[PDB]
Enzyme design. Structure first.
Site, PDB file in Angstrom:
ATOM      1  N   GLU A 174      41.847  48.147  35.685  1.00 26.00           N
ATOM      2  CA  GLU A 174      41.987  47.310  36.901  1.00 26.00           C
ATOM      3  C   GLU A 174      41.589  48.027  38.200  1.00 26.00           C
ATOM      4  OE1 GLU A 174      45.839  45.475  36.901  1.00 26.00           O
ATOM      5  OE2 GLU A 174      45.369  44.312  35.094  1.00 26.00           O
ATOM      6  N   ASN A 179      39.046  48.870  31.299  1.00 24.02           N
ATOM      7  CA  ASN A 179      39.636  47.547  31.041  1.00 24.02           C
ATOM      8  C   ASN A 179      39.864  46.843  32.373  1.00 24.02           C
ATOM      9  OD1 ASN A 179      40.908  45.791  28.939  1.00 24.02           O
ATOM     10  ND2 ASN A 179      42.841  46.234  30.033  1.00 24.02           N
ATOM     11  N   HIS A 195      42.310  36.884  30.396  1.00 24.54           N
ATOM     12  CA  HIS A 195      43.415  36.041  30.821  1.00 24.54           C
ATOM     13  C   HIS A 195      42.864  34.775  31.480  1.00 24.54           C
ATOM     14  CE1 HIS A 195      46.426  38.882  29.759  1.00 24.54           C
ATOM     15  NE2 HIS A 195      45.880  39.835  30.498  1.00 24.54           N
ATOM     16  N   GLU A 223      43.218  41.286  25.949  1.00 24.75           N
ATOM     17  CA  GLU A 223      44.507  40.708  26.340  1.00 24.75           C
ATOM     18  C   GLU A 223      44.445  39.170  26.402  1.00 24.75           C
ATOM     19  OE1 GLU A 223      46.087  42.541  29.862  1.00 24.75           O
ATOM     20  OE2 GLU A 223      45.332  44.566  29.324  1.00 24.75           O
ATOM     21  N   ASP A 267      44.696  35.405  26.452  1.00 29.51           N
ATOM     22  CA  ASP A 267      45.611  34.290  26.458  1.00 29.51           C
ATOM     23  C   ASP A 267      44.933  33.205  27.309  1.00 29.51           C
ATOM     24  OD1 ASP A 267      46.313  35.294  29.094  1.00 29.51           O
ATOM     25  OD2 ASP A 267      48.128  36.258  28.307  1.00 29.51           O
TER      26      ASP A 267
HETATM   27  O1  LIG Z   1      55.421  42.810  30.042  1.00 30.33           O
HETATM   28  C1  LIG Z   1      54.400  42.704  31.042  1.00 30.33           C
HETATM   29  C2  LIG Z   1      53.051  42.993  30.425  1.00 30.33           C
HETATM   30  O2  LIG Z   1      52.692  41.971  29.516  1.00 30.33           O
HETATM   31  C3  LIG Z   1      51.996  43.129  31.503  1.00 30.33           C
HETATM   32  O3  LIG Z   1      50.806  43.497  30.843  1.00 30.33           O
HETATM   33  C4  LIG Z   1      49.704  43.590  31.750  1.00 30.33           C
HETATM   34  C5  LIG Z   1      49.058  42.231  32.002  1.00 30.33           C
HETATM   35  N1  LIG Z   1      48.071  42.383  33.083  1.00 30.33           N
HETATM   36  C6  LIG Z   1      46.993  43.297  32.665  1.00 30.33           C
HETATM   37  C7  LIG Z   1      47.528  44.683  32.183  1.00 30.33           C
HETATM   38  O4  LIG Z   1      46.480  45.475  31.659  1.00 30.33           O
HETATM   39  C8  LIG Z   1      48.662  44.527  31.144  1.00 30.33           C
HETATM   40  O5  LIG Z   1      49.267  45.784  30.883  1.00 30.33           O
HETATM   41  O6  LIG Z   1      52.361  44.124  32.397  1.00 30.33           O
HETATM   42  C9  LIG Z   1      53.509  43.774  33.129  1.00 30.33           C
HETATM   43  C10 LIG Z   1      54.705  43.672  32.176  1.00 30.33           C
HETATM   44  O7  LIG Z   1      55.866  43.270  32.884  1.00 30.33           O
END
Ligand SMILES: O[C@@H]1[C@@H](O)[C@H](O[C@@H]2CNC[C@H](O)[C@H]2O)OC[C@H]1O
Length: 301
Positions: free
Chosen positions: A127, A169, A206, A235, A237
């Site tokens: 990120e 990522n 996402h 990731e 969804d």
């Molecule tokens: O439990 C959550 C978790 O799912 C979240 O995961 C991130 C989603 N956004 C992109 C990142 O690369 C992931 O690690 O992180 C926050 C937690 O509270």
């Protein structure tokens, strides 16, 4: 094949999930995840705050619960994540410049040593780009330490564990026409020009109304692959879990030779970080959703 992982494996790919250690006493969760997936990402336990809660002082207990569960159940593991603006422990938030740079390097080295030879892919950096039209780097202590922070993280990781595929990522980098996507493309291009050891790009995937799936995802995947990197959907969804979009994404990966596989970001809707958007393949009760069937069918051709 009758399960996602085995169906993916027919083409040399994987189908994975995020696993949370706090859910590992739920028998529905462990048995469905055990059955369906051949790749695991720790949802939280391999992040910086979890693994190095005080400088120099590592805690692999929860990480190893996830890792060991994965290997016991016949899954490989993606390591997530070594260098990131988010979920930093306070001691690291307090660092800047050269002190932060050393701490960043030391953190990479310590975590990767613990898992040396055991982690097939690492999200080395997560990120780093801003959202929106600029294609700028996100503001963080890491970015303020210099534009080179990302490349230094990758060089560090390559030396620490030559066996691991090193991934960058990010999210909102799936639509070929977006400025963020192009920022990531040009970084990876540059890294390749300069011998920076990046092996893979992770597309968080996402998808939702504000950042919707586009057919040009396949173009994005193809174009990154052509830079000389693998691509992975890390990731996934999708708001509302429409079967159509889930099939489209699966078929995009299947169409790109260097697409390693797909990880969905959780098991049941109720396990999702965005559960209100019901965005996964299994219902709260563990039953298969229409999207499950669409994904399995796509994997099976
Ligand atoms: O439990 C959550 C978790 O799912 C979240 O995961 C991130 C989603 N956004 C992109 C990142 O690369 C992931 O690690 O992180 C926050 C937690 O509270």
């Amino acid at each position: 094949e009758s399960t996602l992982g085995a169906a993916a494996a027919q083409s040399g790919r994987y189908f994975g999930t995020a696993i949370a250690s706090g859910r590992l006493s739920d028998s529905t969760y462990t048995s469905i995840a055990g059955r369906e997936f051949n790749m695991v990402t720790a949802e939280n336990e391999m992040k910086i705050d979890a693994t190095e809660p005080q400088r120099g002082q590592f805690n692999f207990s929860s990480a190893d619960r996830v890792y060991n569960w994965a290997v016991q159940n016949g899954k490989q593991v993606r390591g997530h994540t070594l260098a990131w603006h988010s979920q930093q422990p306070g001691w690291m938030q307090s660092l800047s410049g050269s002190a932060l740079r050393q701490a960043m390097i030391d953190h990479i080295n310590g975590v990767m040593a613990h898992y040396k030879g055991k982690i097939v892919q690492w999200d080395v950096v997560n990120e780093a780009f801003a959202d929106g039209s600029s294609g700028a780097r996100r503001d963080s202590n890491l970015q303020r330490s210099g534009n080179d922070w990302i490349e230094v993280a990758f060089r560090t990781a390559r030396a620490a564990d030559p066996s691991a595929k090193l991934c960058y990522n990010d999210y909102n980098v799936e639509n070929w026409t977006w400025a963020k996507t192009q920022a990531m493309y040009n970084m990876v291009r540059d890294f390749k020009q300069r011998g920076v050891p990046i092996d893979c790009v992770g597309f968080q995937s996402h998808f939702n109304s504000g950042s919707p799936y586009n057919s040009n995802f396949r173009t994005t995947l193809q174009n990154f692959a052509a830079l000389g990197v693998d691509v992975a959907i890390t990731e996934l969804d999708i708001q509302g879990a429409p079967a159509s979009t889930y099939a489209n994404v699966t078929n995009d990966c299947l169409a790109v030779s260097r697409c390693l596989g797909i990880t969905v970001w959780g098991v049941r809707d109720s396990d999702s970080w965005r559960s209100e958007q019901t965005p996964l393949l299994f219902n709260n009760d563990g039953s298969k959703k229409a999207a499950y069937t669409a994904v399995l069918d796509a994997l099976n051709g």
